[PDB]
Amino acid sequence: RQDLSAIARTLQEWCVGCEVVLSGIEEQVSRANQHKEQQLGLKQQIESEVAN
Amino acid sequence: FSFKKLLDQCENQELEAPGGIATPPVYGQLLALYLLHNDMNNARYLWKRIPPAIKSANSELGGIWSVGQRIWQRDFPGIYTTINAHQWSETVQPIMEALRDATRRRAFALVSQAYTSIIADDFAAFVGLPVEEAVKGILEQGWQADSTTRMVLPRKPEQQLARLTDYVAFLEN
Amino acid sequence: SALEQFVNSVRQLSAQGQMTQLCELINKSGELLAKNLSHLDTVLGALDVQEHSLGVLAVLFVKFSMPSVPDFETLFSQVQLFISTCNGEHIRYATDTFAGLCHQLTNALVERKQPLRGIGILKQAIDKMQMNTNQLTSIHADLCQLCLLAKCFKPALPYLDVDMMDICKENGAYDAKHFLCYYYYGGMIYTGLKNFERALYFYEQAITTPAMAVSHIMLESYKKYILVSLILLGKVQQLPKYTSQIVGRFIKPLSNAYHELAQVYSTNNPSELRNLVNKHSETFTRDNNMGLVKQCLSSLYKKNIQRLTKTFLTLSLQDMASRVQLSGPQEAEKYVLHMIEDGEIFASINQKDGMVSFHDNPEKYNNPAMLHNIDQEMLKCIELDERLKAMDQEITVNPQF
Amino acid sequence: TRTISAGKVNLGAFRTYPKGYKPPDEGPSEYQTIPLNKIEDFGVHCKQYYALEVSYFKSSLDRKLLELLWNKYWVNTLSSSSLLTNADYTTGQVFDLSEKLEQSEAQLGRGSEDKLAKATRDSCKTTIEAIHGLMSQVIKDKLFNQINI
Amino acid sequence: AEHLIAQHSAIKMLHSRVKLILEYVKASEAGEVPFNHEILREAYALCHCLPVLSTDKFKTDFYDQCNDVGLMAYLGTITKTCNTMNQFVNKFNVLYDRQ
Amino acid sequence: LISARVDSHSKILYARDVDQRSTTFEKSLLMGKEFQRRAKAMMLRAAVLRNQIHVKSP
């Protein structure tokens, strides 16, 4: 109970780490779908050129 | 440390200011700064560009080119002789002291990985220091030392997910 | 009465939807343009000096007769401000005389004294001419010619580093030798800096270029190209199959003394090799590439020792001295140090006994060290895919089948 | 083996047609890497049948149990490691990939329609997995190793 | 999206658990929330028992794997470049070139 | 096929075997770097022919 903060702080760094990754996933997940919607949109522009 | 940002300024003033030929102290620093960042090819062709006018008048510039000879020749004791010779204060004397230090740790990081065993006298001259200071300098490091034969024995010396996700989405299309 | 009229015709076309009639004013000129155009260039800098300055400057440097009297400082400071921050925009659509502006400015400065300022000016001349990913214009060829002769290879490297696709023509404005010049000079540029890899690749692209006749650059690039591969490697680098037919038929046996060099090289005999260089000392020194031929003399000594790694793992200095032919344990210990210091071989020395130990071991691919290089080397292949994908979409819009 | 490496249920449900009557037109059929040793056998009899639209269901108890189960099953997700588990699929697919290129290389030369377009898709397919594997690995290195004492 | 969905809401469970323990840790020392020796004890272990492998050997092996996977990506990317190249080559060597 | 090095100090012959790992890595870098080098070349080669670049004779 002297160093109960020495136990608490080590726990916080892991709680921080949990957020570090959680948000880190959601960025990379939303970007991997965005790069798929980047190409799917850009490949519709390549095909519509042929209509001329 | 800051010699990098300052060398940039010298090289610019070569083509910037003059109709062709830069200032005589600007030539004195460009030659010595190339030696500081071990660029002997740049130091060689710089010397051959100087007009014979500034060459003859500015005789201290010859004292800096005499250093470059020894770096090309790799006569390491000759380097430290030629560094301790010409006092060109304000302009060059600050970069001459930094030159001797870069050549020293080059020859230490070299000798350490190039020799399992080596003569103390050679080792002394190759780094520049005398016999005692060399024998001491290494004993601090924890290098093995040998009496009688005089043989120093050198000891040999999101971020990640963002990168990955790209290589997926790239190959994925 | 006529020369003071069409100074207004340039300004009237300027700031309009079309300046395609200005493409006929700069081409006409009137041939015999009087001394009077010096005046007309002062009451001019309105929007940004227009393409008027280009029509004027083209005639000045193509006098080939008294540049502008010995006031060529007036003639340079004239071109100095035009090339700097005036630039314009439609320089792209008039490279007819703009390519020629940089050619004549060069040709003069070469034979004059030295272009050390002349290099600095020619840099910005490229930048609003080429648009995006660098485009191989004739100015690149000259920029090298200046900074080759003016012993200052530093500033041209920014452009030599990028392997620019797409040849900038525009009103023709490109010559069948200004391709050879860039990659010939460039090759030599890196040769002095001792970037032999890039040096070889440059000379290579010179030899490829198609040619119904034997041009004179192609013979020299080949001779030095021979020396580069014999220092970089220990052998002859073969060319592409698409090299010009005039090369293997004529140019190759014309540079015979350099193949004759490789003849002895593969035998690994420096003493014999040296006796060949002394015979054709003339032929080699005639081409001002002696020294580079002597760099091969040293690379053979370094090849000789490079082989030992594959056979022996512990060898004496004396043994090495006797086997490498250098004689004396110092000369042996010498190149050991240098090769190590440089990083051509993995070895070390035990002076106490007087032995050379061959580490023979670099890296185990077990750390970020590779991981980073793996990341970087890969990104350069993806960079390469990006280009090809754009280059594939370039073909999309053009005619049918 | 691929259910694992691909990281999701690799499954199929099919029904064959009569020997006499032959199928209608409407048929996209999605591409999967077929090893060349087998590509022939598939290729012949592949058009003789038709697949079935798969769907997955569950009971109330099953659904309620799996939710109560997940209290302690998240641990297995972050000590998963699909690498030494199915090591002998990915190491094998290379052998398959190498052959598919070998063909299309000589196809360009002298001499089934552009077998580099397949091989390109296979090189991605197999490597896409290999990369996805190292995603869950670094995810773990981030988590459990980097706390300090 | 179809891969990291697993980790996303799985680690959500990890964060849910790890945080709610630390909520008890702060409130126990703060007081009023019942102080307990035989629960807080296991927490002292739990948190220092972390540094889950920082052994010189382990990480070498971890990087050993990464480099292997990396090699596979380098070769895989060359393949895609090689196809995208030949996609461009044929379209150039027919429209531009006369076979 | 004598895959073995020479220790001429103590005059011994040791067998020298291959680091499998090193091998496949090593060459993959180098091959890829070769592929990159030719890609540079055939990009310029696409350009020179596109511009009809050649030195004529007569």
Side-chain angles (χ1 to χ4, degrees):
Chain A
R1 204 180 65 76
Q2 184 80 50
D3 308 76
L4 221 159
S5 54
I7 299 166
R9 189 208 57 75
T10 24
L11 252 165
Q12 188 72 42
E13 192 173 341
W14 197 8
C15 297
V16 166
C18 288
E19 297 170 52
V20 163
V21 181
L22 274 165
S23 57
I25 294 159
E26 293 151 40
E27 183 183 40
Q28 299 301 327
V29 171
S30 188
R31 282 179 69 265
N33 250 312
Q34 176 53 40
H35 198 88
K36 180 56 169 168
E37 256 61 56
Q38 178 182 345
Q39 296 264 216
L40 282 169
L42 284 168
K43 201 173 185 294
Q44 279 194 19
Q45 296 183 35
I46 295 162
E47 296 164 30
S48 57
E49 296 266 314
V50 182
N52 309 348
Chain B
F1 186 80
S2 60
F3 297 99
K4 299 137 190 178
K5 298 129 195 165
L6 298 162
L7 170 53
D8 286 315
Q9 297 180 36
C10 295
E11 294 192 342
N12 306 336
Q13 290 182 354
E14 191 63 33
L15 321 188
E16 278 180 336
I21 313 162
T23 345
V26 173
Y27 275 138
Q29 292 173 321
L30 285 162
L31 182 66
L33 280 160
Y34 283 136
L35 301 174
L36 243 166
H37 301 85
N38 207 310
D39 210 323
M40 285 308 313
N41 290 317
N42 287 357
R44 190 190 181 183
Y45 293 111
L46 175 142
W47 178 250
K48 305 277 186 176
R49 183 172 61 264
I50 316 306
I54 294 168
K55 281 194 175 193
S56 61
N58 214 282
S59 51
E60 217 95 306
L61 190 70
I64 301 162
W65 177 235
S66 65
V67 179
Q69 291 160 14
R70 275 60 199 75
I71 293 163
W72 191 285
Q73 290 281 311
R74 294 170 192 174
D75 180 42
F76 294 97
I79 298 169
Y80 309 125
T81 305
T82 52
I83 289 163
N84 297 317
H86 84 91
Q87 272 72 32
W88 191 344
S89 56
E90 306 278 317
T91 311
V92 188
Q93 193 58 31
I95 66 170
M96 286 286 288
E97 295 166 28
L99 176 62
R100 203 174 65 264
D101 302 335
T103 303
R104 185 146 295 181
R105 286 185 319 286
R106 171 194 159 199
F108 193 92
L110 174 63
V111 165
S112 55
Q113 302 175 17
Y115 293 84
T116 304
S117 73
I118 187 166
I119 308 156
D121 305 350
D122 262 66
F123 169 65
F126 262 71
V127 307
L129 295 169
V131 178
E132 256 64 358
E133 194 84 56
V135 166
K136 202 184 85 166
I138 66 98
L139 285 165
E140 171 166 292
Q141 193 68 13
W143 283 23
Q144 187 85 44
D146 189 20
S147 51
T148 312
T149 60
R150 266 280 165 281
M151 296 300 294
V152 176
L153 289 159
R155 312 263 77 174
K156 190 166 184 177
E158 285 285 336
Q159 273 191 314
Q160 287 71 32
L161 287 163
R163 297 166 205 180
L164 300 184
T165 314
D166 292 13
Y167 305 130
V168 176
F170 166 75
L171 297 169
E172 182 202 342
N173 297 336
Chain C
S1 56
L3 279 164
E4 300 178 326
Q5 309 307 313
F6 292 82
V7 177
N8 305 345
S9 71
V10 177
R11 290 171 144 180
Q12 288 158 22
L13 280 164
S14 187
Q16 295 293 322
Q18 60 85 28
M19 298 181 195
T20 50
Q21 206 69 9
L22 191 64
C23 300
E24 204 63 33
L25 273 165
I26 298 169
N27 197 54
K28 287 280 173 287
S29 316
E31 285 293 334
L32 293 156
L33 281 300
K35 49 145 185 172
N36 309 332
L37 303 186
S38 176
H39 291 251
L40 298 176
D41 221 317
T42 203
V43 190
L44 196 75
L47 206 67
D48 49 6
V49 198
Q50 288 78 276
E51 304 299 331
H52 193 109
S53 43
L54 188 60
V56 172
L57 289 168
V59 178
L60 266 164
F61 281 84
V62 185
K63 291 280 180 180
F64 290 121
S65 167
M66 310 170 287
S68 179
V69 324
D71 295 330
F72 36 80
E73 274 291 348
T74 62
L75 188 61
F76 185 88
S77 58
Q78 187 185 4
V79 177
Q80 186 184 339
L81 294 166
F82 169 69
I83 300 288
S84 60
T85 52
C86 163
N87 68 283
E89 201 82 304
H90 313 298
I91 303 300
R92 185 76 194 179
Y93 311 108
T95 67
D96 183 33
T97 45
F98 197 93
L101 175 59
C102 304
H103 287 309
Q104 301 294 336
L105 181 69
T106 294
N107 282 313
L109 266 162
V110 164
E111 205 212 317
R112 176 174 298 285
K113 304 289 173 185
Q114 195 187 88
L116 212 60
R117 70 180 154 184
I119 299 157
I121 275 63
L122 225 80
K123 290 187 75 175
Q124 285 214 46
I126 300 165
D127 292 310
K128 209 76 226 78
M129 195 190 191
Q130 84 188 3
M131 300 292 94
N132 286 38
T133 63
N134 300 20
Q135 298 165 347
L136 186 62
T137 185
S138 37
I139 299 174
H140 288 88
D142 290 341
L143 180 66
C144 303
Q145 187 171 9
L146 298 173
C147 78
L148 179 93
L149 298 165
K151 308 306 177 188
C152 181
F153 321 112
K154 199 72 169 57
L157 293 160
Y159 303 103
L160 294 166
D161 283 15
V162 180
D163 288 329
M164 62 215 72
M165 65 253 269
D166 208 306
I167 283 72
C168 172
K169 26 172 188 196
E170 298 276 22
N171 310 324
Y174 202 67
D175 177 42
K177 292 191 179 182
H178 299 160
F179 188 84
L180 290 164
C181 294
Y182 171 75
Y183 284 109
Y184 177 68
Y185 285 129
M188 295 171 72
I189 284 168
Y190 287 107
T191 312
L193 302 168
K194 313 203 170 172
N195 192 336
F196 295 98
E197 185 203 318
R198 192 151 189 79
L200 190 74
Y201 174 70
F202 269 56
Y203 292 127
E204 192 166 25
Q205 276 291 308
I207 300 157
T208 53
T209 317
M212 294 166 65
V214 177
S215 41
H216 319 287
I217 299 158
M218 296 183 80
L219 249 163
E220 255 291 354
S221 71
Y222 195 94
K223 290 167 189 181
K224 292 182 158 70
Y225 181 91
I226 287 163
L227 302 183
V228 175
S229 61
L230 291 164
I231 303 161
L232 175 70
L233 327 168
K235 46 200 170 188
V236 177
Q237 163 63 16
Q238 286 301 324
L239 306 161
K241 188 175 169 186
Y242 64 82
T243 48
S244 189
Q245 267 284 17
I246 63 95
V247 178
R249 294 273 174 177
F250 295 82
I251 290 183
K252 178 176 192 194
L254 276 159
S255 53
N256 187 44
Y258 300 87
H259 272 270
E260 196 172 45
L261 194 75
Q263 202 98 40
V264 183
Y265 197 95
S266 52
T267 67
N268 299 4
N269 195 322
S271 63
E272 201 75 3
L273 175 63
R274 196 150 54 197
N275 295 353
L276 169 63
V277 177
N278 283 292
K279 183 175 183 180
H280 276 288
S281 56
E282 287 177 304
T283 315
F284 301 121
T285 55
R286 186 201 307 157
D287 304 333
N288 289 325
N289 51 20
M290 174 67 75
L292 291 177
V293 74
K294 295 208 166 192
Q295 276 197 324
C296 302
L297 187 70
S298 51
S299 74
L300 191 69
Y301 283 120
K302 292 179 172 172
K303 192 198 172 178
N304 284 19
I305 300 160
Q306 275 167 300
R307 293 170 81 77
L308 291 169
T309 45
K310 301 143 74 175
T311 55
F312 302 92
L313 210 75
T314 320
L315 189 65
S316 171
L317 295 162
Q318 196 60 28
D319 286 35
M320 189 184 295
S322 191
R323 290 196 209 284
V324 180
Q325 305 187 2
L326 281 163
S327 197
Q330 325 107 61
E331 288 257 298
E333 191 173 6
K334 272 192 172 69
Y335 281 92
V336 168
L337 185 75
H338 295 338
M339 288 174 75
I340 291 160
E341 187 180 318
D342 293 319
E344 292 171 306
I345 188 170
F346 285 84
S348 186
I349 304 160
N350 184 291
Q351 272 197 315
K352 211 279 175 158
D353 297 333
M355 298 288 164
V356 186
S357 188
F358 295 85
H359 272 281
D360 219 58
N361 291 127
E363 229 290 66
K364 300 285 187 170
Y365 310 87
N366 59 351
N367 52 353
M370 295 299 175
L371 208 69
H372 280 292
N373 260 47
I374 291 161
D375 201 67
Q376 291 187 38
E377 283 277 9
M378 187 193 302
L379 282 160
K380 295 159 187 172
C381 275
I382 295 162
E383 178 88 325
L384 221 50
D385 183 81
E386 291 272 299
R387 288 283 137 74
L388 291 163
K389 281 194 165 187
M391 295 263 284
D392 202 317
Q393 185 156 6
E394 290 263 329
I395 299 162
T396 310
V397 192
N398 272 306
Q400 315 301 287
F401 195 90
Chain D
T1 342
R2 273 194 215 181
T3 295
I4 296 158
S5 70
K8 230 150 185 285
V9 173
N10 206 328
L11 181 145
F14 301 82
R15 270 186 68 83
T16 55
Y17 273 113
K19 177 188 166 191
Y21 163 60
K22 300 293 176 188
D25 263 308
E26 279 278 29
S29 205
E30 199 179 52
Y31 174 54
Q32 270 189 99
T33 299
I34 319 302
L36 293 169
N37 37 301
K38 281 287 196 170
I39 200 172
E40 298 261 315
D41 195 5
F42 167 70
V44 177
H45 306 268
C46 58
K47 289 285 179 183
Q48 302 187 0
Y49 56 81
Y50 78 109
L52 286 84
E53 178 167 305
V54 182
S55 42
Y56 306 86
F57 66 88
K58 55 197 180 185
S59 73
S60 62
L61 179 64
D62 286 316
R63 189 169 62 88
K64 286 195 279 188
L65 270 164
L66 286 165
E67 199 170 40
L68 295 169
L69 179 70
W70 200 258
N71 301 329
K72 208 160 199 165
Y73 208 74
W74 57 265
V75 174
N76 308 4
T77 315
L78 300 171
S79 55
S80 55
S81 184
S82 175
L83 270 149
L84 289 177
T85 315
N86 66 282
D88 305 310
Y89 164 73
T90 55
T91 52
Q93 278 276 310
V94 168
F95 234 64
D96 162 50
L97 193 60
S98 175
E99 292 185 345
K100 281 213 175 201
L101 298 170
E102 193 175 0
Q103 293 183 337
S104 57
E105 186 180 320
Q107 189 202 315
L108 288 166
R110 311 301 188 281
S112 52
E113 185 69 35
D114 180 21
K115 281 192 164 169
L116 189 62
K118 295 188 190 185
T120 313
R121 213 71 274 178
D122 294 4
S123 64
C124 294
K125 161 62 176 168
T126 309
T127 313
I128 282 162
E129 295 169 358
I131 301 154
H132 276 120
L134 203 66
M135 284 194 160
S136 73
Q137 304 305 333
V138 175
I139 281 163
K140 295 182 293 170
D141 189 37
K142 295 262 182 182
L143 285 161
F144 305 99
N145 308 8
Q146 297 163 209
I147 304 295
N148 270 308
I149 301 95
Chain E
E2 310 202 64
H3 193 83
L4 295 179
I5 184 55
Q7 277 91 17
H8 163 74
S9 49
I11 299 156
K12 178 183 172 180
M13 227 55 54
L14 173 60
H15 188 41
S16 178
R17 304 284 182 282
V18 171
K19 182 66 181 181
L20 295 172
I21 293 166
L22 177 54
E23 292 280 55
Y24 172 75
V25 170
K26 291 186 290 188
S28 294
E29 192 180 25
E32 308 278 30
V33 176
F35 192 78
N36 196 292
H37 292 237
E38 310 309 318
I39 299 299
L40 293 168
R41 188 168 41 75
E42 292 171 32
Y44 173 84
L46 175 59
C47 308
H48 295 309
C49 293
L50 274 156
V52 179
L53 292 307
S54 71
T55 75
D56 287 353
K57 294 173 283 181
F58 160 74
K59 287 188 174 160
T60 317
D61 297 26
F62 176 51
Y63 284 116
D64 267 33
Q65 160 168 113
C66 308
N67 293 301
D68 256 42
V69 174
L71 188 71
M72 204 147 167
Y74 190 64
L75 295 162
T77 46
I78 288 160
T79 315
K80 183 159 176 276
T81 312
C82 177
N83 183 68
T84 311
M85 176 177 287
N86 197 55
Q87 285 275 26
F88 148 79
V89 164
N90 294 344
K91 294 169 188 180
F92 185 82
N93 251 31
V94 176
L95 281 165
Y96 259 102
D97 189 26
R98 304 287 76 189
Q99 304 286 45
Chain F
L1 311 177
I2 305 297
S3 185
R5 296 285 178 281
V6 185
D7 177 357
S8 60
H9 175 224
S10 41
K11 303 290 186 182
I12 311 163
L13 207 75
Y14 289 69
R16 187 79 175 184
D17 284 23
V18 186
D19 188 290
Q20 182 88 73
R21 175 177 178 77
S22 298
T23 325
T24 306
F25 264 89
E26 171 193 329
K27 71 173 284 184
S28 298
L29 154 65
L30 299 160
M31 183 286 294
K33 203 170 69 171
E34 311 314 320
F35 166 55
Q36 284 172 21
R37 197 176 87 98
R38 298 142 189 165
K40 298 162 182 270
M42 66 145 274
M43 216 82 75
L44 293 164
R45 199 57 183 179
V48 298
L49 302 167
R50 176 168 57 204
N51 258 235
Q52 286 282 297
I53 303 294
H54 59 287
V55 184
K56 288 194 175 176
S57 182

